[PDB]
Amino acid sequence: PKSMQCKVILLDGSEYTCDVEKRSRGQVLFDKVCEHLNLLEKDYFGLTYRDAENQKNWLDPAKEIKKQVRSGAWHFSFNVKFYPPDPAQLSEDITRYYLCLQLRDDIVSGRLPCSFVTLALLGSYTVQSELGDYDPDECGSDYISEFRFAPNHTKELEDKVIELHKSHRGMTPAEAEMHFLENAKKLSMYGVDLHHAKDSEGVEIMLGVCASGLLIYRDRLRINRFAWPKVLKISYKRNNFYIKIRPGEFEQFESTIGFKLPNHRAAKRLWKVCVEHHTFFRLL
Ligand SMILES: CNCc1ccncc1
């Protein structure tokens, strides 16, 4: 029985290596990684791989791994797929811990923009969780943490993490991670998957996929949201993506809204993540 080596980058930056039968469906590998991580609340997570165009794709757990990675290496990342709107309602602290690790990478990477003060507050909870109570013996006036808190570090930010860290004495790791998440969940880009697109007029926009629906971003002043319940049908055709909207009260007809994606793979990818969000957050 022939086995393929899999490598998975975990959210702590370490690498998990295992073997699966070469005809294995994604669920097989996902189950191995989740067992490694001691993770029971698996529904919020998934594996990503990079396609021949170097685009991130979700590994479909129902489909053969070989038919998704195709010509590429069996190399994956473990990621949050569905960001819970209320992390306090997760059943296990360890689920919240992995969600914190994902959000820390969202922040450092710049995918999740964040004010100075919220960067310092999130950093202070991370430090409290991982090191425990503030110790002056470990930080002089010139302290620069090993912890990565932001896309760009300043001394002022390091100073502010330390000042807030002092305020958290007595806080336990689950308690600090819960505070981290109560702040992070409020950020306007929390759990938003962004896709470059053009509107039916050719104007460059971003489409955001999240718990609360499909968002449009255009020129800042020009924003729109389609809550998932309003969306009856998601479709793609060539380089185009469509949402069918329920008729409004007293309106005769449904409405279809159309967007142009970079290419056909990008339209199919946006379609699949929307359908998945629509189903997940309909049920959650
Ligand atoms: C040795 N590292 C290989 C790799 C694993 C996952 N993603 C990208 C590269």
SS3 (DSSP) at 219: coil
User: Are 49 and 67 spatial neighbours (Cβ–Cβ below 8 Å)?
Assistant: no
Q: Which two tokens stand for residue 38?
A: 């001691």
**Separation in Å, CA 213 to CA 111, 171, 174, 282:** 18, 35, 30, 10
Protein residue whose Cα sits closest to atom 6 of ligand 1: 75
Measured in Å, residue 51 CA sits from the centre of ligand 1 at 13
| Sign of CA pseudo-dihedral 275, 267, 226, 96 | positive
Protein residue whose Cα sits closest to atom 8 of ligand 1: 75
Name the structure determination technique.
X-ray
Protein residue whose Cα sits closest to atom 5 of ligand 1: 75
User: Are 240 and 258 spatial neighbours (Cβ–Cβ below 8 Å)?
Assistant: yes
User: Are 120 and 141 spatial neighbours (Cβ–Cβ below 8 Å)?
Assistant: no
SS3 (DSSP) at 67: helix
Measured in Å, residue 280 CA sits from the centre of ligand 1 at 29
Resolution, Å (one decimal): 1.7
Ligand 1: residue of 5, 7, 51, 79 to mutate (most ligand atoms within 8 A of CB) is: 7
**Separation in Å, CA 221 to CA 25, 72, 217:** 44, 41, 8
For 167-250, list the strands marked E by DSSP.
193-199, 204-210, 213-216, 224-226, 231-237, 240-245
Measured in Å, residue 237 CA sits from the centre of ligand 1 at 33
* Ligand 1 atom with minimal separation from the 49 CA: 7
User: Are 103 and 118 spatial neighbours (Cβ–Cβ below 8 Å)?
Assistant: no
User: Are 181 and 99 spatial neighbours (Cβ–Cβ below 8 Å)?
Assistant: yes
Q: Which residues have C-beta atoms less than 6 Å from ligand 1?
A: 7, 9, 15, 75-77
**Separation in Å, CA 107 to CA 53, 110, 195, 227, 238:** 25, 5, 18, 25, 34
Protein residue whose Cα sits closest to atom 1 of ligand 1: 7
Q: Partners of 280 in the beta sheet?
A: none
The residue count for the chain: 284
Measured in Å, residue 200 CA sits from the centre of ligand 1 at 38
Ligand 1: residue of 4, 12, 15 to mutate (most ligand atoms within 8 A of CB) is: 15
Q: Which two tokens stand for residue 89?
A: 């309602």
